[PDB]
């Protein structure tokens, strides 16, 4: 597609000679037949470009590298417009011109990590172009170390322009038919002068042509128009979008940079002076230090300026301070950047001296600067400079701004544009929120949502939750891209602002949990907490200003985005914190006992509820009788109470027909009743299961422990009475049915987890296991390697595996508990006697299981096993694990609390829900079972979440850290003001004359 290039552009030749040696430079065997101070146009030939093309540098490299030659009369807008289209290097945000001969083989190591830190960071933020000499020599091949060890560490487009004669290597450059490959000896082994080879680094070259054997300054002229032309282009879109901004940056050189930065000065480009670069660089430091320095006495500074800053030739000539005033003349234009020791940042430099720059004041020219102010993270001084006040804005003006910022996670530019009056309701658009989350970075969690999913959003949390107002909407935006910022700047603008707080701790934690990066979600989780840690802290301001106002309306309302009651989103959440504050637990102890008050004494319900009558006395603290009574019997605590009672009761009458009515005849009457009384608890639970999306409840419902351990007993007793109706397994479905007993009495601990004094320990004992299994296993170990030597040494006739076993491991288990048969090993207390002709002696236990004889060898080897064994299992192992769970009580004591709280209110949700009538009882119930105040509370709560905000924020301003900072700042102000006072009292000093 490149066919067109070398008609617009065109290669100059020298053409005429001009006086063994030419003025031209370019001394061959002859020129032309066709060929004074020889001049770039007056003897030069112009013919098409024959070096255009794109260098493929031998060895590493990116192979694609663009090279053109082109004459210096040349226009900016061409080679700009086929940098622009051609070769597909996007509109520049930025472009920062290095200039400076920077004299010596290396620069100052210092000088280099601000080119490779402040320079190089800040264009890749921005994509900035950097223009600079196309060479590997001096500045050039600085910058190219600077941008290949940022890359390294990783593109940074940075485009070269070059005088073609000092190209080395031009011969693989030359191609009239066009090289879209192209071999460039890079790695040119002779250094020889003048000609250098182009630094494989930068990712264009625009190899200026003068007709010249190799010269310095040709670039020039060619490389400022590009730079005004730049400088007066807009990025993108066409003229849609906003100018350019421009930056040249200067390190030491000679004169001649002093007379680029004054042509430059005289294009209206902005220029920035490091300081400490050295000769042509710190002169003009110096002069801006000074500024208006008076004439007497400093009029012959600004030679000796130039007689110690820059090199002696020349130095005394007046024309370099002629400059220096023109130079001056434009002082606004350019500034200074000092070093300030390593400072390593100049973002804010940068900024400082565009806006100064500008001089405008119709906030149309300042797009550029704020937008480079969002893409880089300097707020302060936008604020400070762009928002001083001094240029009105509209919202229009804002929007790109305000885009940038949300796409490129700025929170503290965020709020400070929305602080601007933006309307941000009539901003807000459906292509927008596409605009946003297409933001997603690279193959984000979210765009994978998203795939599998026009935002769709809906679809998302249909899918995430289960399936079972602008502000929203962006704080929804930022929790699925974890804007943390963004998403806590969003909800303090909410208006639900409790529950959205849960709701969004709800999210990231579902959202955690899904995310496979392994890292991404312990942000996730750490953002989670700090929405529970938000929404807690302002319940709990607005439970103390109105206890029911708050407690009753704000939390048992539906909630917005979704139909779960606001503590249901608290459940699935799984805030432990949330549940922890009084006014939730004061809350669910309300509930827990209904219409009745909830100090009423247990005691007195306990005779309330064997006493129905008593009811209506003064006992108890709340047609009117009607009414009364099921609000007594509907409360769940008397539904606990009443389903326990009936509890007990069961396993009594189990117990009963367990121990005494069990017979291998017909089932009795009693028999019968706990078979009907189980099959009642059976479609109870059933109840539970089904009324907990079939596969959904049925699976959260499993998810409890206590409905596994009914499901376990129930089934047990329906295998006990299958196997006891059966002829031949009487005794079969005997021995189950005493297990199944057991089930259900240790189902009986879900009374104690009621009692606050209990329920905690209650869940401490369920993290003890870690500690039982470790000393199962260890005394396990030891009891075979024990029990087995035992056996062993003993070698008794009996060797009957049933006995074995128990000799091995039941025996030496016993022991554990001091049960000790010495008789049974020690061969001094047993008879002699004689068994088996095998060799040896033996001895006759009188234990049942010991053995019917035993030898004797050894017996004082099974005796010293015996005392080792006592001293280990007995003593250290179960020492041992005392320590460990005092260890584990202590630790484990705070977080089980926590978890008792969160849980009391899945148990009481339970019972709310439960039918009045007891188990025994339940199968009639079963048979019978077959605006304007939202507003008003709306407000009230953001008004309390705003004082909460306010008194936060105040807090922290009026913290010793603040007050330092703030003191110090108005010190450095104070230092200010006294040196301008001091340059006042010298010029009175001098008026007093
Ligand atoms: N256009 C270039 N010409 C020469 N060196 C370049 C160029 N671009 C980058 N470099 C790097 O600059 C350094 C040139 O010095 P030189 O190659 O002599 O030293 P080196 O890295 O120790 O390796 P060696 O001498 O073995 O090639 C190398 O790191 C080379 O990779
Ligand atoms: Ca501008
Ligand atoms: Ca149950």
């Not at 294009?267 to 002069?287: I, K, R, Y």
């Not at 309390?944 to 922290?956: I, M, P, T, Y």
Request: aromatic share 10%; charged share 20%; glycine share 8%.
């Amino acid at each position: 597609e490149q066919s067109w290039i070398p008609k617009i552009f065109k290669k100059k030749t020298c053409t005429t000679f001009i006086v063994t040696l030419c003025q031209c430079g370019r001394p061959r065997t002859a020129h032309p037949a066709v060929a004074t101070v020889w001049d770039s146009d007056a003897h030069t030939t112009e013919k098409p470009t024959d070096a255009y093309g794109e260098l493929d540098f031998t060895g590493a490299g990116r192979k694609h590298s663009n090279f053109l030659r082109l004459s210096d009369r040349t226009d900016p807008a061409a080679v700009y417009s086929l940098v622009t289209r051609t070769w597909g290097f996007r509109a520049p945000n930025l472009v920062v011109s290095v200039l400076g001969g920077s004299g010596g083989p290396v620069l100052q190591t210092w000088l280099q990590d601000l080119l490779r830190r402040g320079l190089v960071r800040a264009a890749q933020s921005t994509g900035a172009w950097i223009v600079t000499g196309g060479l590997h020599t001096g500045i050039g091949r600085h910058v190219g170390v600077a941008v290949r060890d940022h890359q390294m560490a990783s593109k940074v487009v940075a485009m070269g322009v070059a005088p073609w004669g000092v190209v080395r290597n031009r011969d693989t450059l030359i191609n009239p038919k066009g090289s879209f490959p192209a071999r460039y000896r890079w790695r040119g082994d002779p250094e020889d002068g003048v000609q250098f080879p182009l630094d494989y680094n930068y990712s264009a070259f625009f190899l200026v042509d003068d007709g010249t054997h190799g010269c310095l300054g040709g670039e020039n002229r060619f490389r400022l128009r590009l730079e005004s032309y730049i400088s007066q282009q807009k990025t993108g879109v066409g003229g849609t979008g906003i100018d350019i901004p421009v930056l040249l940056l200067l390190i030491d050189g000679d004169e001649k940079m002093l007379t680029r930065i004054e042509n430059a000065t005289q294009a209206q480009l902005p220029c920035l002076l490091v300081a400490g670069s050295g000769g042509a660089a710190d002169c003009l430091a110096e002069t801006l230090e000074d500024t208006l320095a008076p004439g007497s006495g400093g009029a012959r500074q600004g030679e000796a300026r130039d007689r110690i800053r820059r090199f002696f030739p020349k130095g005394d000539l007046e024309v370099l301070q002629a400059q220096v005033e023109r130079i001056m003349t434009r002082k606004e234009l350019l500034t200074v950047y000092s070093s300030e020791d390593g400072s390593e940042e100049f973002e804010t430099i940068v900024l400082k001296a565009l806006v100064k720059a500008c001089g405008s004041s119709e906030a149309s020219a300042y797009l550029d600067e704020l937008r480079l102010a969002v893409a880089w993270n300097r707020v302060d001084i936008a604020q400070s400079e762009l928002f001083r006040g001094d240029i009105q804005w509209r919202s229009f003006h804002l929007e790109a701004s305000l885009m940038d910022a949300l796409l490129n996670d700025r929170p503290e530019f965020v709020r400070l544009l929305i602080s601007h009056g933006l309307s941000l309701g009539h901003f807000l658009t459906p292509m927008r929120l596409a605009q946003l989350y297409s933001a997603a970075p690279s193959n984000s969690l979210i765009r994978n949502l998203l795939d599998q999913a026009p935002p769709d959003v809906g679809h998302v949390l249909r899918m995430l939750l289960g399936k079972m107002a602008p502000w929203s909407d962006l704080l929804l935006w930022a929790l699925l891209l974890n804007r943390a910022q963004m998403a806590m700047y969003f909800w303090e603008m909410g208006s639900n602002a409790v529950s959205s707080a849960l709701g969004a701790c709800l999210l990231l934690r579902v959202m955690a949990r899904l995310e496979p990066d392994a890292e991404e979600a312990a942000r996730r989780k750490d953002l989670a907490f700090k929405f529970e840690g938000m929404g807690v802290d302002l319940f709990g301001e607005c439970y103390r200003s109105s206890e029911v106002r708050a407690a009753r309306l704000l939390l048992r309302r539906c909630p917005l985005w979704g139909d779960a009651t606001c503590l249901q989103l608290a459940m699935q959440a799984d805030a432990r914190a949330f549940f922890a504050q009084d006014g939730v637990q004061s809350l669910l102890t309300q509930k827990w006992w209904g219409d009745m008050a909830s100090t009423t004494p247990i005691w007195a319900l306990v005779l309330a509820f064997f006493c129905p009558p008593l009811i209506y006395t003064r006992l108890i603290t709340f047609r009117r009788c009607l009414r009364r009574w099921f609000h007594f019997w509907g409360a769940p605590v008397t539904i606990f109470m009443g389903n326990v009672v009936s509890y007990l009761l069961f396993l009594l009458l189990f117990s009963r027909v367990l121990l005494v009515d069990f017979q291998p005849a017909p089932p009795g009457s009693l028999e019968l009743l706990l078979y009907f009384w189980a099959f009642t608890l059976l479609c109870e639970e059933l109840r539970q299961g089904l009324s907990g999306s079939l596969s959904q409840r049925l699976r959260l419902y499993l998810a409890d422990s206590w409905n596994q351990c009914d499901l376990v007993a129930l089934t047990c007793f329906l295998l006990g009475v299958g196997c006891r109706l059966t002829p031949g397994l009487y005794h079969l479905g005997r021995t189950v049915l005493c297990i199944d007993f057991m089930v259900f009495t240790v189902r009986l601990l879900h009374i104690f987890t009621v009692n606050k004094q209990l329920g905690p320990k209650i869940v401490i004992v369920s993290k003890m296991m870690k500690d039982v299994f470790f000393f199962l296993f260890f005394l396990g170990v030891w009891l075979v390697a024990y029990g087995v030597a035992t056996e062993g040494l003993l070698r008794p006739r009996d060797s009957d595996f049933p006995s074995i076993l128990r000799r091995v491991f039941y025996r030496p288990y016993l022991q554990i508990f001091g049960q000790i048969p010495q008789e049974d090993m020690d061969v001094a207390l047993m008879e002699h006697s004689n068994c088996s002709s095998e060799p040896g002696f033996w001895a006759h236990p009188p234990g049942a299981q010991a053995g019917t004889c035993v030898s004797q060898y050894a017996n004082w080897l099974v005796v010293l096993l015996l005392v080792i064994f006592l001293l280990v299992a007995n003593i250290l192992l179960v020492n041992l694990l005392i320590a460990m769970f005092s260890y584990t009580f202590g630790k484990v004591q705070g977080n089980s609390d926590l978890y008792w709280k969160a849980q009391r209110y899945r148990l009481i949700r339970e019972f709310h829900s439960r039918p009045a009538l007891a188990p025994p009882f339940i199968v009639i119930s079963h048979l019978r079972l077959l605006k304007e105040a939202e507003r008003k509370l709306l407000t009230w709560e953001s008004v309390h979440k705003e004082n909460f905000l306010l008194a936060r924020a105040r807090d922290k301003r009026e913290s010793d850290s603040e007050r330092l900072k703030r003191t110090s700042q108005k010190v450095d102000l104070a230092l200010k003001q006294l040196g301008h006072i001091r340059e006042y009292e010298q010029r009175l000093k001098v008026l007093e004359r």
